[PDB]
């Protein structure tokens, strides 16, 4: 009398899966479909390091704030890291028109070189480019201004009609940022440009706008009684941009020749940047996985798994775990 | 039916418990185990691999005068979150049912293979076991494991033992 | 197999019909009915409770100069509508098919338990019925029904009345 039996494998595992008809089913083997681990670093997407700005935001870096000269400008980046406590940008108060649009275009650049579009010593012999400093933008305790801009003041007692043009012939889009100062009092306008009624004109093939400065008193922000609107315009290669003003033109000296990429974002996080490579990015730290779902953060940049509200997504692989 | 699993079985998912005059223990069926492992590995790889996500950035930035488009983007993200959460939990639950039912069916067709092979030469005593009427040594009992059992060699001995 | 259901059962989804000298009637199998009721209730509650929505406002307002953003919002709403309608319809039909197959599996499992318990002591006459070769009393009926049938006690009587 011999006995042959049929049975199945059991482990000491306590991995419980959830099924439709039954919850909390202990199985022999399970495979997690949910990723809940991150490295706690801000890595490089597609092998290109991000652009960390530190205490500066995008406006302070792209306008040349005096607190942002220590930052390095790389040839290319994949995304932009901004500290949540960063407050260094637009030291002189006013509105940055289409700020978020420019932040979207500057999210990923494959080739970013900075050049002097208009040299300070060889473009304006008729205008004063040295007294354009203010207490809104201090540098080592002294008065300074934006690095990428020049606040042109009258040369003695005369601010004549201004006319400058830049020819783009380097095969890349050139981004040009300028500003229009709005003095609080007409005495400030007489002290700065001496013409009580001025205008600013910036024109291109696609861009054409005539700016009139507005002379009225405002609430005092950073000890400034008047505002300053900052504008921007991409310039196609083989095209030119003209600057024309009786006054109130804060004219670029450095412009940026960029070739842009698509599909990037800006991360607001305190997570430090480390030398690492991931295909997925997250403000809490990068994700390196192949599972289709994750529950770390909704805002992800890269080829990232779909964010779910789940806490446990385990797929059963082996049999039921019934030891007896 | 079969009450519990075998913690002494490590060579495979599916197998046997031989016992005769000269031995007892366990001997896992390698073919059915390897087929089930390949099938459920393809199941997990098919769930994982069919998700192809393009290069994208979820977050968008809006100022104080784009509250409607900000709420539109938040509504888009929350609807995607609800769709993906419901589909993920329901896919996990239905696929876990189908995996466990696949395991129970593998148990039952292994039982059916040995039952259809043995015929009247053994006795069904419950919990997947067969008590042999004849003398079936380890060559015999190993030959039952794969599908090379000679019924008429032991049929007369089982007929004499049954009555 | 089993052609039709029985209206006379009230307390159970599954059960037995015994007919002997002392009478007849319908007795429900409480274990399988309670297991099926718990599993089906957990299945339904798994369908509802995975809908983890948040607070939201679906409707957006626009002026006449934001027709493109309005059409984007309508495209978002129609895509969410199509996804949820297709997923809900296919989910309901697939789970209805799985529920009917589960009930058929419970019927076949009860039949397999009874058929493996009785063995050769009864005839398989069809329509889910076993006629006993021996005089199976009422105590014999619920000895079958709680899983403690005495096969060799009635084996001699079943062999006598078989031929």
């Amino acid at each position, epitope marked *: *009398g011999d006995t042959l039996c049929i*049975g199945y494998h059991a482990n000491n595992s306590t991995d419980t899966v959830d099924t439709v008809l039954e919850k909390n089913v202990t199985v022999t083997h399970s495979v997690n479909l949910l990723e809940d681990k991150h490295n706690g670093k801000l890595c490089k997407l597609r092998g290109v390091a991000p652009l960390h700005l530190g205490k500066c935001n995008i406006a302070g870096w792209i306008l040349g704030n005096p607190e942002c000269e220590s930052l390095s400008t790389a040839s290319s980046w994949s995304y932009i890291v901004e500290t949540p406590s960063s407050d260094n940008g637009t030291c002189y108060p006013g509105d940055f028109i289409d700020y978020e649009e420019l932040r979207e275009q500057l999210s990923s650049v494959s080739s970013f070189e900075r050049f002097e579009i208009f040299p300070k010593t060889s473009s304006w012999p008729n205008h004063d480019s040295n007294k354009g400093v203010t207490a809104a933008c201090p540098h080592a305790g002294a008065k300074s201004f934006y690095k990428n801009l020049i606040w042109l003041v009258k040369k003695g007692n005369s601010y004549p009609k201004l006319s400058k043009s830049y020819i783009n012939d380097k095969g890349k889009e050139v981004l040009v940022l300028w500003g229009i100062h709005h003095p609080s009092t007409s005495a400030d306008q007489q002290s700065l440009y001496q013409n009580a009624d001025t205008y600013v004109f910036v024109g291109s093939s696609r861009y054409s706008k005539k700016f009139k400065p507005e002379i009225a008193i405002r609430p005092k922000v950073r000890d400034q009684e008047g505002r300053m609107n900052y504008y921007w315009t991409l310039v196609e290669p083989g095209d030119k941009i003209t600057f024309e003003a009786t006054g109130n033109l804060v004219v670029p000296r450095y412009a940026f020749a960029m070739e842009r990429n698509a599909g990037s974002g800006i991360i607001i996080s305190d997570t430090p940047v480390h030398d690492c490579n991931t295909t997925c990015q997250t403000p809490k730290g990068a994700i390196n996985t192949s599972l289709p779902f994750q529950n770390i953060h909704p805002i992800t940049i890269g080829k990232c798994p779909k964010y779910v509200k789940s806490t446990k997504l385990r797929l059963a692989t082996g049999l039921r775990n019934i030891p*007896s | 039916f079969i009450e519990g699993g075998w913690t002494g079985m490590v060579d495979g998912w599916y197998g046997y418990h031989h016992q005769n005059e*000269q*031995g*007892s223990g366990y001997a896992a069926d390698l073919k059915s185990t390897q087929n089930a492992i390949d099938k459920i590995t393809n199941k997990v790889n098919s769930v994982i691999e069919k998700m192809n996500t393009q290069f994208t950035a979820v977050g968008k930035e809006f100022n104080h005068l784009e509250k409607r488009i900000e709420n539109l983007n938040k509504k888009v993200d929350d609807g995607f979150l609800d769709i993906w959460t419901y589909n993920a939990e329901l896919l996990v639950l239905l696929e876990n049912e189908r995996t466990l039912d696949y395991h129970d069916s593998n148990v039952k067709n292994l039982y059916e293979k040995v039952r259809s092979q043995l015929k009247n030469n053994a006795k069904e*005593i419950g*919990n997947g*076991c067969f008590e042999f009427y004849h003398k079936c040594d380890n060559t015999c009992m190993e030959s039952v494991k794969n599908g090379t059992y000679d019924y008429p060699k032991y049929s007369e001995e089982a007929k004499l033992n049954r009555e | 197999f089993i052609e039709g259901g029985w209206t006379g059962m009230v307390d159970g989804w599954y059960g037995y019909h015994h007919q002997n000298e002392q009478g007849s009637g319908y007795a429900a199998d409480l274990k399988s009915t309670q297991n099926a009721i718990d599993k089906i209730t957990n299945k339904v509650n798994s369908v509802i409770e995975k809908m983890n929505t948040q607070f939201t406002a679906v409707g957006k307002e626009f002026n006449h100069l934001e027709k493109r953003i309005e059409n984007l919002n309508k495209k978002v709403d129609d895509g969410f509508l199509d996804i949820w309608t297709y997923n809900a319809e296919l989910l309901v039909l697939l789970e209805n098919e799985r529920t009917l197959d589960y009930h058929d599996s419970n019927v076949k499992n009860l039949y397999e338990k009874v058929r493996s318990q009785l063995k050769n002591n009864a005839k398989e006459i069809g329509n889910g019925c076993f006629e006993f070769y021996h005089k199976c009393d009422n105590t014999c009926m619920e000895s079958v029904k709680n899983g403690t049938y005495d096969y*060799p006690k009635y084996s001699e009587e079943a062999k006598l009345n078989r031929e």
Partner: antibody
Amino acid sequence: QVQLVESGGGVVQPGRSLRLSCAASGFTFRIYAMHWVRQAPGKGLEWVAVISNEGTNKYYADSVKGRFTISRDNSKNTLYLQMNSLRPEDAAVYYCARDPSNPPHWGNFDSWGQGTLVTVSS
Amino acid sequence: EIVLTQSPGTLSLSPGERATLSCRASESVSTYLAWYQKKPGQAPRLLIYDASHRATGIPARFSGSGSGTDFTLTISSLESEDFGVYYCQQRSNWPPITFGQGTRLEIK
């Protein structure tokens, strides 16, 4: 509770035939497998034989193979053991014990009996 | 057969302390190992089965360990009724069931 009362022990010459019995009560005899365990004087416990719950397959130890025959009566709720041509090493105290599981999980001994002494002497 | 060698052959300990009892195996029995007790004149008693599960009516002071070759039985508190001769049980590869030679646990 479970009760296992043994009987049939005594003094027998070598080469004769002896039979023991083990009366069971308080539980269903026909669903639990049955055993016999002996302990020789000056030795340890030695397993003797096993019968199933329906009494179909039978195993004996290597020393007592061929000479021994286990049997049971499920109607009378009584286990048995038969010897032919006993040995001087066969003299021991014999315990009947209950297997708490089935031919899937044969093995250990949940309940025991008082036991009877077999004295094989001339 | 899977022979079962018990070491040491005699454990002499005072009541109230820890006791250990080993039973080596020639073949790995996975976890299917049990232990037994034997008073002089009384019936044997099943304390632990499958090397981790204690039986009903057994005090919690008895506990076993081991998986495969080496198996040990540990008594947390030696009371006055714990003295006797102890045996180890294999059930993995049995056409014969093989016991250990025994460990006589006494009063010193």
